[PDB]
Amino acid sequence: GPLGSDLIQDVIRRAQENKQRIVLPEGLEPRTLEAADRLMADKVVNIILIGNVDSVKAKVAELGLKNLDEAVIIDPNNHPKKQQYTDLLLQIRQKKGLTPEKAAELVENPLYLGCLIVKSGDADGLIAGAQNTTGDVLRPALQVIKTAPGMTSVSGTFLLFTKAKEYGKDGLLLVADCAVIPNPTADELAQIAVATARTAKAIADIEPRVAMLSFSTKGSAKHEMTDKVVEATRMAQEMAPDLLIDGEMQADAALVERVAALKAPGSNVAGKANVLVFPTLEVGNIAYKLVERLGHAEAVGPILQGMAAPVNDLSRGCSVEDIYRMVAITANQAIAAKEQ
Amino acid sequence: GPLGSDLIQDVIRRAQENKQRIVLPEGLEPRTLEAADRLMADKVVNIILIGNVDSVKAKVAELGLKNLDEAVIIDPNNHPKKQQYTDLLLQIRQKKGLTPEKAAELVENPLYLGCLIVKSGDADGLIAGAQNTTGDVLRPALQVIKTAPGMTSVSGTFLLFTKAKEYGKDGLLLVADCAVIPNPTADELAQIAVATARTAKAIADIEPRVAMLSFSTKGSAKHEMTDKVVEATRMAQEMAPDLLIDGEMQADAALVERVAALKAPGSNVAGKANVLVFPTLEVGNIAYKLVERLGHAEAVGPILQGMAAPVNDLSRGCSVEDIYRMVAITANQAIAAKE
């Protein structure tokens, strides 16, 4: 929306105006059910819960939730599309090797079923990870839904709502990769830059100005590490000639006009960056957390980028609000994909 | 700024209570002379200025400074210890290929002379860089003064005065290495941890809780990069078994008790960190700058650590206050080096 600080409210509203179907494989997980209850009450999405119908209904009753009577519940052991989904899974895993017998096992795994629902067009997005490892969430996602065209990996971005309104869009920047890839290749780093810029435009209403960060600015501190960022910058520009991407540059050159004017003259990014691309996961994971904690920024994420259809992974330590927000964001990813 | 001011007053007081000799090789640089004037008025340190005596006196008179009459001024071209210092430089560097001829050239260089004064024990520390490159300041420092016992490398730390008083010491943490080493070895990273902990005690009166940072916490995300931090943690503990150092851990595990309880139970650091050790310069240089800019934190530094006697390097764009502060910090480092 017009102010970057109001983005979460805008995300919720956008979801409400165009209701999407979101699958929650963790249909008995309490925080997930609490979130689903509020989401359904607020008309944000149409919820699909995975689990034994009697078990799920009993859990809803046990937690005292009142807004989930009209939620779709699908039992992985018994539902109308079970054989169809089994055959689809076999088709996908035919070359790598999957027998009918163990396809029949896997289709009853809620995480696999969830991905097959989305892949089949019977839902618009999936969220899990409140009671599953990231690895266990991502494995069926990458096996069944897969990465989007051109993308060889997925990455995680955060909305960083900072108290420095003079930077980004009223203090908001997107930053990546903060979750997935330990040490991106130049090619992987270029993918991250393009994906994060696309996410920024599509979901956050930001006109991207993408800074490829380094301890060097435009050859000030040459090093093999610096070379990787330089190459990633060139590769990202080739991938997406429409985007404003520049690098390599230090964090102060990215944000501060005075510094940019000296260290990166004429740059279309330096001094007004609103998307920060970190060279490694050590940088990404440490830096966003320190900006959050030491800077009192609000960090919303991780938002997964590069999947062929919207899949997000929650922290196992997530709050109910975290789930509510990430479901709304998942819906916005789906809406964006449909409008483009 | 307001965030830094109380600790900085403590640094100044500690300097005043145990006066050290600080060499200023840039004895004609105006900001340096303004700083030296206030430092001498406040009895923070004993200043040694390097330059032609008549040139320095003329400059002081031109600027109208009134507190520098008793400052020691040493002319590199003409002073009674010139031969002694030349021979010391040769003793240190002759095996590295320094000739007597070239030693006699270098002793006339104020940065080399300054380092030779310190190395001789005729001063306690040195600051420069208002009108010299970092490279030119550090070269004689590393050649002549060299690294402290157990250190074979130096690093740059910042006092990061954050607006999050619930973390570190009323919002203050020391963070390193933010300046020097692109990709520390496990050994170099261990040295950073120990050096930064010692700097934290010496300068900030902090009881160190040192977090060796990673994208992993205690084996949550195993990787070659994670392995390096794990090894650095073990090596740091071996170097200084007295210090409270733990890792590998994520930044949230370092700072947040609730997260520490889940991800690093029983840690002697997690949830209480006041010193953050970054695994690479990409991490260090990006992270402190983003906390400064996006977080409105005040970053005082870089402070160079690991030297046998303190040498610090100012920005060429530094303020008078920057110089005053860094001299006081250098003095506190000198006090620590003498213990």
Numbering used by the authors:
A (entry chain B): -3 to 336
B (entry chain A): -3 to 335
What did the published study say regarding this structure?
Porphyromonas gingivalis, a black-pigmented Gram-negative rod-type bacterium, is a keystone pathogen linked to the onset and progression of periodontitis. In many bacteria, the enzymes phosphotransacetylase (Pta, EC 2.3.1.8) and acetate kinase (Ack, EC 2.7.2.1) form a key pathway for production of ATP from excess acetyl coenzyme A (acetyl-CoA).
The polypeptide region in which Asp309, Ser311, and Arg312 are located forms part of the side of the cleft on the domain I side, with Ser311 and Arg312 positioned at the edge of the cleft, and Asp309 located near the bottom of the cleft. Mutation of these residues resulted in the complete loss of enzyme activity. The D318A mutant displayed only 11% of the specific activity of the WT enzyme.
